[PDB]
Amino acid sequence: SPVVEVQGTIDELNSFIGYALVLSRWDDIRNDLFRIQNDLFVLGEDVSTGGKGRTVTLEMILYLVERVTEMKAEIGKIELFVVPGGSVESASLHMARAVSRRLERRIKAASRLTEINDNVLLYAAMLSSILFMHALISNKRLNIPEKIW
Amino acid sequence: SPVVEVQGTIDELNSFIGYALVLSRWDDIRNDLFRIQNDLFVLGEDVSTGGKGRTVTLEMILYLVERVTEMKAEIGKIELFVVPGGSVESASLHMARAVSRRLERRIKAASRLTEINDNVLLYAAMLSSILFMHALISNKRLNIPEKIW
Amino acid sequence: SPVVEVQGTIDELNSFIGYALVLSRWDDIRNDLFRIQNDLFVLGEDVSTGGKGRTVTLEMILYLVERVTEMKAEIGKIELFVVPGGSVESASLHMARAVSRRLERRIKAASRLTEINDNVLLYAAMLSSILFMHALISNKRLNIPEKIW
Amino acid sequence: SPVVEVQGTIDELNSFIGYALVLSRWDDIRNDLFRIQNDLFVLGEDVSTGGKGRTVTLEMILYLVERVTEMKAEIGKIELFVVPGGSVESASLHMARAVSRRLERRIKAASRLTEINDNVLLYAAMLSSILFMHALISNKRLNIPEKIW
Amino acid sequence: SPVVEVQGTIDELNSFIGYALVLSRWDDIRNDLFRIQNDLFVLGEDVSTGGKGRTVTLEMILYLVERVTEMKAEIGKIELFVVPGGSVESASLHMARAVSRRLERRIKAASRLTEINDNVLLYAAMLSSILFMHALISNKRLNIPEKIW
Amino acid sequence: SPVVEVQGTIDELNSFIGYALVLSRWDDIRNDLFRIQNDLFVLGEDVSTGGKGRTVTLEMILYLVERVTEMKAEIGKIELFVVPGGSVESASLHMARAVSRRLERRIKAASRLTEINDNVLLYAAMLSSILFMHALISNKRLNIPEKIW
Amino acid sequence: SPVVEVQGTIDELNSFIGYALVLSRWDDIRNDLFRIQNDLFVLGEDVSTGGKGRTVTLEMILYLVERVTEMKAEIGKIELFVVPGGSVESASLHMARAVSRRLERRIKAASRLTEINDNVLLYAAMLSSILFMHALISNKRLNIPEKIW
Fold first, then answer.
1. Other beta carbons less than 10 A from residue D40's beta carbon
2. Facing residues of E1 across strands?
3. Sign (positive/negative) of CA torsion C20, C24, C29, C33?
4. Are A121 and A108 in contact (CB under 8 A)?
5. Apex CA G112: angle with CA G108 and CA G113, to 5°?
6. How close are the terminal C-alpha atoms of chain C, in Å?
7. How far apart are CA C21 and CA A54, in angstroms?
8. What is the rounded distance in angstroms from the CA atom of residue G64 to the CA atom of residue G130?
9. Residues B61, B39: Cα–Cα separation, whole Å
10. Do A101 and C8 touch (CB under 8 A)?
11. Which residues pair with D148 in a beta bridge?
12. Which residues contact F19 (CB under 8 A, 6 or more apart)?
């Protein structure tokens, strides 16, 4: 039942990814988001069945980790307090990642209430990180230097 | 007071419809969303006055039901676990419908707390359904075949 | 800890401003939103340090008040129950202001729980008002007369 | 048996933390490393019993995540290709984190061979990250500005 | 050829002993490590010549056994899962002994591949034990009571 | 992928240089190690891009050769089987050079597997040599005559 | 054209090796010099074709490195400022290695002028080193202890 407010936020996020995906131009970015959208579905079933069904695997989170590390190299010095937006695609991704931070904080509650896989939460945490990286990457690749606070 | 968090989500939704409406190209879709935006206003007053004022009528929900049934015919086999987005208009509508599922789950709480019309909740439930149908319809009409999980 | 759900909504809002900023064409509007985005950051630190650090100053809220009063003059009779959207920029701003009303209602909770500056809440309240004004202003300046309920 | 080469690297790491801990002056840093040293022990048993015994919990990794996020704020713009060392404590921590990257790459092999908890690997990954943060933090707090490549 | 990865670890260890030796204050400890450093050299030739040359003698391992037994008396109850470090000298020795466990596990592989004296492996095993004893002894003699898991 | 175990050892080495650099007192030595630390970075990119990017140049290895030849003159008769350590700086450098021999033996494997520049391996070989010279030089300059086997 | 003065010195060296080869008694030494004489030929073609043809491979230089390291063990403390000669074979090799230092300093010029493989120069550098080792080895094996300056 309060785990129902978790799934709602999952599809609320899938909707925000869905928008930032049609928006983004980069093939790598697009494929990451498509895979993320399918993993969001696996993440839904891992809460509903509560581990019984399609469990959120380590290999899924590691692909997020890999991409985070690979894209990190393009940006170089990743800044703190980066004023969101600038590019349309960057702004669209910042909106999806904000909802990702909104998801993990909804999961943390349902984690306290009923049993749910640790991987679900880790994946959500990771998703925020990977989503921020695409919004910096969309900006460098468009030559729109990010305005820092 | 916790019914104040219900109205906030109503206008948060009206804002998301408002975006998907300027976005969508189809006249039918646009008119449905305009009517939905005005019904959202009636839905606001039906919580505030708590039935005293402009009650959310059956005829309002039935127009949603009618459109759902009419559009259903265009899509044919409506799929399960349809990865959201693809088209800009479709993605924009998926975002508005996600917030619609976010509204009815906020109403369900205020329903438990203080008295509010049953129609308000039914309308919200129906709104999610009608909003999904426009995002499938925007996709077929744009010949962007939906990617299913 | 429930103050962590406040910051999340702050950056969730910063993301929505960020989108409406790249979207809006007007220089005045853009600069207001940029300043608002930086003030959102000051607003973050004023919750975290709980007044210890960079306090949200009166002068910050007064700049919002000034702009509200200056833009008010352009619209003239500001209407009640204005159906959101019409213009792309107007719809984008209505979405950001809806989240602003979502922020102050999250702050009101954390206000009851732990100590946080009164200015933080006042600023959020003011932000909703200033954000509505830009979505009316984008509409008059684009000659898209707002549809009232 | 090739899982025996994993434990060896765990205590080889515990030894490197042990050195950087007596070395570091900061109380926060010291306590993180002490807790990390005890978690390394839990991490040992989670490989040996292969989940049967003292499993490496989510809450353990989340404390690493929390510290990473809290310390991140002190450094601000965390740079890429930061030439290691400068301070004695910073150099000592860089050596321990290098061995941490050496541990997770030993785990990844034993992960392919026999069953071992996903958390074990995630914890190791996280440990590299948290260990880098202490070596940047030791540097800012000592006012030894890091030389970037 | 894979026996070349054995020698590398021998001098990698000699380097770690070399550091813990300049570090340690105790004359007995220092002399043990010096002798250990010279025996490491004999141990190198016993792999290279593969028994032909300077064989690793029983008397060499027995001196390690003697010291282990003599120092054992000073510590009394030698604890299990002793969190490494505390003292600078103790931490430095724990690092050298960790590499000693790293050496015998490299030897065990080269033992399976080509012929090498049994004493070489026994000596390495013994070396880990004697190296742990110095890191407990440095701690009691400095009155830094070891923190046990 | 097994080339990933090569980079890990590169930064594991950079960490050991980093320590021996803060440790060493001599300006020449320090500058050599700083340059070596930056060349280690070039060496990383020459494996990752596999020659595509920042190739490890001849001129880089020749600067190592030059220093080896210049420092050689100070020591005079460079001895065989020199028991490592004596000085703190000398011991610290012996540890870094031991890891350098550990790096080239990791490269030799990745050389057999996938294509990587010959210069990368030559540089690593050279690095062991130059690192030994600093640990003899730290000793003569401190008047700590090296104990030979 | 100034690369023609490089080849002349190559065959001028091959002639000096040729003499020291008939001169030397040791089978190992003889085979090294024969291989060196054939590698000198490969080294000729690598300048003429300028990399197009038979490139001077890493494996060639590594065989020189291997022999240098293997013979190093026989001499032990290799001295500085070793007065050349003593034995006929030693004197003959010192003459060939002097010309080898004469070759690399001719290559360094042609390196500045036109493109030539880095390996060519490295090989020449290495050749001087390997040639010195044979002249020390001829001396120990003949029991003619070298007179040092």
1. 24
2. none
3. positive
4. yes
5. 115
6. 40
7. 41
8. 6
9. 9
10. yes
11. D82
12. D85, D88, D91, D92, D94, D95, F92, F95, F96
| Contacts of B15 by beta carbon, 8 Å cutoff, 6+ apart | C84, C85, C91, C94, C95, C97, C98
- CA C65 to CA C67: how far, in whole Å? 6
Q: What is the DSSP letter of A33?
A: H
Q: Do C92 and B4 count as a contact with CB atoms less than 8 A apart? A: no
What tokens does G12 get?
């001028």
Q: Which of G82, B33, D55 is nearest to C83 (CA)?
A: B33
Q: What are phi and psi of B76, to 5 degrees?
A: 80, -125
User: Is chain C touching chain B, with at least 3 CB–CB pairs below 8 Å?
Assistant: yes
Please report the number of interchain residue pairs, chain B to chain C, with beta-carbon separation below 8 angstroms: 60
Token pair listed for E95: 């690092």
Residue carrying structure tokens 């299990």: E80
- Which tokens go with F93? 């450098």
Which of B1, B10, B15, B41 would best serve as a mutation to test chain C binding (most C beta carbons within 10 A)?
B15
Long-range contacts of A44-52 (CB under 8 A, 24+ apart): A44/A7, A44/A10, A44/A11, A46/A116, A46/A117, A46/A119, A46/A120, A47/A3, A47/A6, A47/A7, A47/A10, A47/A110, A47/A116, A47/A117, A47/A120, A48/A7, A50/A114, A50/A115, A50/A116, A50/A117, A51/A115, A51/A116, A51/A117
Length of chain A: 149
Mark out chain E residues that contact chain F at CB-CB < 8 A.
4-5, 8-9, 11-12, 14-19, 21-23, 34, 37-38, 41
Indicate the burial class of E90 (C-beta count within 10 angstroms; 0-12, 13-18, 19 or more).
buried
E11 touches E52 (CB < 8 A): no
Q: How far apart are CA D36 and CA D28, in angstroms?
A: 12
Most A CBs within 10 Å, among D74, D77, D146, to test the A interface: D77
Write out chain F in H/E/C secondary structure: CCCHHHHHHHHHHHHHHHHHHHHCCCHHHHHHHHHHHHHHHHHHHHHHCCCCCCCCCHHHHHHHHHHHHHHHHHHCCECCCECCCCCHHHHHHHHHHHHHHHHHHHHHHHHHHCCCCHHHHHHHHHHHHHHHHHHHHHHHHHCCCCCEC
* Cα G8-G9-G12 angle, rounded to 5 deg: 90
Rounded to an integer, what distance in angstroms lies between the CA atom of residue F96 and that of residue F20?
A: 7
Q: Which residue of F has its CA nearest to G77?
A: F79
C-alpha span between D120 and D134 (Å, rounded):
21
Q: How many CB pairs under 8 A join A and B?
A: 60
Residue E117, C-beta contacts closer than 8 angstroms, at least 6 positions apart:
E46, E47, E50, E51, E55, E56
On the 0-12 / 13-18 / 19+ scale of CB atoms within 10 A, A37 is buried
D80 with A81: Cβ contact below 8 A: no
Cα–Cα distance for residue pair F33/F39, rounded to 1 Å: 9
CA atoms within 13 A on the CB side of B130: 27
Separation CA A128–CA A117 (nearest Å): 18
Do B124 and B107 form a contact (C-beta atoms < 8 A)? yes
Q: Nearest-CA neighbor of A71 among A13, A32, A23? A: A32
Experimental technique, in short, is X-ray
Do E91 and D15 meet the contact criterion of CB atoms below 8 Å apart? yes
CA dihedral over A135, A137, A143, A148, signed as positive or negative: positive
| Number of other residues whose CB lies within 10 A of the CB of residue C99 | 25
**In this structure, what token pair is assigned to residue B141?**
């009409």
In this structure, the number of other CB atoms found within 10 A of the CB of residue E27 comes to 8
* Cross-chain Cβ contact A149/C41 below 8 Å: yes
The answer to whether the CB of G56 falls within 8 A of the CB of G39 is yes
The structure tokens 């103050």 sit at C3
Measured at the alpha carbon of residue C73, what is the angle toward residues C69 and C77, in degrees to the nearest 5? 110
User: Taken in order E105, E106, E110, E115, is the CA torsion positive or negative?
Assistant: negative
Residue with tokens 């890429």: D80
